[PDB]
Structure formats: C-alpha cells, structure tokens
Design a protein around this nucleic acid. Structure first.
Ligand SMILES: [K+]
Ligand SMILES: [K+]
Lengths: 109, 109
DNA sequence: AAGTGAAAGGA
DNA sequence: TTCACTTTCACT
C-alpha cells in the first residue's frame, strides 16, 4: 500500500540495497545502481535486489512461487519511476553505461 | 436505464458485435473480444464496438459530438464489470494475449 | 501509449 | 451501507 516514493526513501535509508545511497541527503539527491544485465559482473543478488523488492512489494513477484524475472522487475521499476511527479532524473550526473553503472535522481520538495 | 447485465445479454443475443458470443448459452458463459488497442490488427469498429455501446448507453459518448475515446470506453466497461455482483470472469480460459485476445465471463444464476 | 485494480467518487 | 456503476490514482 505504501507508494513508491516513501517506499524508496525507506529503501535508501535502510542501506540494504548495494549501491542505493544518497549523494546529498539534504537536497534529496540519490543514486540507483543501474548495471546492464548483459554485462559481465552482473548478478541478480547484487544488481536487482531493489527491482525485486518493488516487485514483491507490489505483488508482482512471490519468492519461490514466481520464476525470477529481473528484466521485468527493472522495466516495471523504471516506468514507475518515470511516472512519479516528485522524483526526476538528473541526467547530467547519471552514467548508465559501463561497469557499476548508475542513475542519479532528485526528490522534488 | 437498462442495467449492465440484461444490457449485455441483449448485446450478445443481437449477434451484431464481432466475437461476442456465448460459449455455453445454457450456463450463460460467454466471451468478449479483448484485443490490446496497441497491437497490430486492432481497429475500433472490430474490437471496440461493445465498449462503445456501453459508453453510448451510459451517456459517456455521443457519436459525432464527442471525439472517440476507445481507451476510456474499455476502462469504464471493465470497471463496471468488476463491480457487477452476478457476472464473474472465468480466468482459466480468458486468453488475454496473442492474435485473438478475449475474456470469458459467466452470468451467475 | 494502452491497460488495470482498488477505492474515492448522478439520480 | 441509497443505488449501480464511474472516475481518479498510481502505477504492461
Ligand atoms: K519521474
Ligand atoms: K464481477
């Protein structure tokens, strides 16, 4: 029932997602790990936990019952992020290419 | 105004809606064409006539006056179907994906 | 973009 | 729950 933004803040603040941290907590600028699933070094446990968590949280994935679908978890998460009116991407800082790729977002006050 | 259940029965019986037919008339089980409007092959006259009629019936669309809005017609129809007490969806046969997407419902006795 | 469940929402 | 759907919201 918890909407994406407050849920996301809780995810960042919990430090339980590798790579998910605030770049500037004050201005609410944070970064999300965004490594390509085709790139060597990618691992479901290291790179998709945040996407999986959103899927579990929204009933789209039931651990043990549903077959892991990282591609959909990521696409669903991105689309949901795109639709949020209070969170926008800071593209000049994002680097969604190469190893340890990531995206930077700022939560609108 | 005629309610949705007897209205729907009339539509199915009129044999004027492409694809809208009883799969088992005695048990009141029928199928409604449910092709995704973005899929290639979708045409308003072929895939959205039923949704359009519910829109016209309920004052939500005046041909010639209102600009066609198949997206809303479908959403309105589905939401009205979801609320109906005596009409349930047979999920086990509602092949929603593919070339010929459809939904199966059953009017409860 | 088209689609959806859930739940707030004229006669 | 006035009733029988209808519209808005937040996200395949
Ligand atoms: K956004
Ligand atoms: K129903």
């Amino acid at each position: 029932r918890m909407r994406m933004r407050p849920w996301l803040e809780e995810q960042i603040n919990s430090n339980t997602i590798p790579g998910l941290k605030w770049l500037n907590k004050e201005k609410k600028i944070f970064q999300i790990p965004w490594m390509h699933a085709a790139r060597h070094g990618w691992d479901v446990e290291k790179d998709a936990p945040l996407f999986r968590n959103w899927a579990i949280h929204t009933g789209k994935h039931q651990p043990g019952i549903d077959k892991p679908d990282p591609k959909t978890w990521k696409a669903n998460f991105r689309c949901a992020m795109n639709s949020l009116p209070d969170i926008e991407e800071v593209k000049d800082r994002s680097i969604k290419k190469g190893n340890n790729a990531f995206r930077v977002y700022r939560m609108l006050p």
